[PDB]
Design a protein around this ligand. Structure first.
Ligand SMILES: [Cl-]
Length: 391
């Protein structure tokens, strides 16, 4: 009850109209109506129009006992009635936690009261579509594990993810996370998922281990601008034909693109450079990629590991950028590379007694004209003296 009189002295409402609906039009089972945001204009018998605050006993037809897709809620004042629609979703929310999802509903629209989705909340769900609500902050482990879900709409408030959420989501065609606040895409997020397209947010800094493992339908991937790290086997056995990644990438873990049978290009973009002496493309990163013809190295990488393109024969030209300071044993060995351009005025260092950094049948190594002798006298590089020339 309001402390002060609300109605005008001497004037009675004759009619009213809903000018703005309540902000909450989606409810969970057992939730109470929330009229916040409702704007009513009353026509009074003194000719003056006035805002009307609806008192609780004036509502009828609202009931959150059972799922209802469209429920008519009526406002009754001065024998006059106006109605609006609400949806009672087949879900239970207790202290902001999605505690229950009811079966037999192919489209789930979550209420705004959902703050977190717990572990396995939609696991094995035989549903088609989920609209995640604004206000959702986190999603728990295996939340959609082996769901038949075809579409998931993500909210701008989504901040935190646990692991294996879309593992075995064979029908999830697209995951548009581009408008979320995610800084990390966790390990095994899309293993065996049918994702054809995954749009990542500008806030993303890390891609977890096996995040896109066995994504056979993923056509391409654009790694967003602020990503620093690509985890162990992040794209192992993915169907990706091309990868775009920023020049700020400092870690590409082992076998990150292992056995991608349709991968043809790895290209870089951006002018942001992150300094870190540990920045490395880890061993056998693109082993088992027989269709790869182009491999751009992130301009923030310092170290090139063993067998980066192991067994490949279609990359015939390679550019090593000026930021590379170290090349390990057999880095580009077991390849079909014929032409390498090493851009560093200062040669990358080689510490092994037996290097095999490039194949025996390499044709030429092009280095800056002012550095030809620095390369020819250097450990490792001296093994290819008769193939070194200027650019
Ligand atoms: Cl409530």
């Amino acid at each position: 009850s309001a402390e002060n009189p609300a109605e005008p002295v001497g004037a009675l409402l004759e009619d009213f109209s809903i000018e703005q609906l309540p902000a909450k039009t989606i409810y969970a089972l057992g939730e109470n109506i929330d009229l916040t945001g409702l704007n009513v204009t009353g026509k009074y018998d003194d000719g003056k129009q006035r805002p009307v605050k609806v008192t609780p006993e004036q509502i009828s037809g609202f009931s959150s006992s059972a799922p209802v897709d469209k429920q008519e809620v009526t406002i009754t004042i001065e024998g006059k009635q106006k109605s609006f629609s609400v949806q009672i979703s087949p879900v239970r929310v207790e202290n902001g936690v999605l505690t229950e999802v009811l079966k037999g509903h192919n489209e789930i629209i979550l209420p705004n009261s959902v703050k977190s989705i717990p572990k396995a909340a939609f696991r094995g769900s035989q549903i088609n579509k989920v609209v995640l609500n604004e206000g959702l902050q986190s999603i728990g482990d295996m939340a959609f594990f082996n769901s038949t879900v075809q579409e998931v709409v993500f909210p701008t408030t989504l901040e935190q993810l646990e692991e294996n959420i879309f593992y075995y989501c064979r029908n999830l065609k697209k995951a548009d996370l581009s408008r979320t606040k995610l800084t990390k895409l966790p390990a095994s997020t899309f293993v065996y998922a049918g994702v054809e397209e995954v749009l990542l947010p500008a806030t993303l800094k890390e891609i977890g281990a096996q995040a896109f493992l066995k994504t056979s339908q993923l056509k391409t991937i654009e790694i967003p601008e602020n990503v620093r790290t690509i985890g162990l086997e992040a794209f192992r056995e993915s169907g990706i034909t091309t990868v775009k990644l920023p020049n700020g990438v400092t870690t590409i873990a082992q076998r990150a693109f292992y056995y991608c049978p349709e991968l043809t290009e790895v290209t870089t973009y951006g002018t942001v450079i992150n300094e870190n002496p540990e920045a490395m493309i880890h061993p056998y990163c693109l082993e088992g990629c027989p269709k790869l013809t182009r491999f751009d190295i992130s301009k923030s990488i310092r170290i090139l590991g063993q067998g980066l393109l192991g067994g490949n024969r279609k990359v015939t030209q390679l550019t090593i950028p000026a930021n590379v300071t170290q090349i390990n044993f057999s880095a580009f060995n077991n390849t079909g590379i014929k032409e390498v351009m090493v851009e560093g005025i200062t040669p990358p260092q080689v510490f092994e007694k037996v290097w095999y950094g490039f194949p025996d049948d390499i044709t030429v190594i092009r280095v800056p004209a002012e550095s030809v002798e620095k390369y020819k006298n250097a450990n490792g590089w001296k093994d290819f003296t008769n193939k070194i020339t200027a650019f």
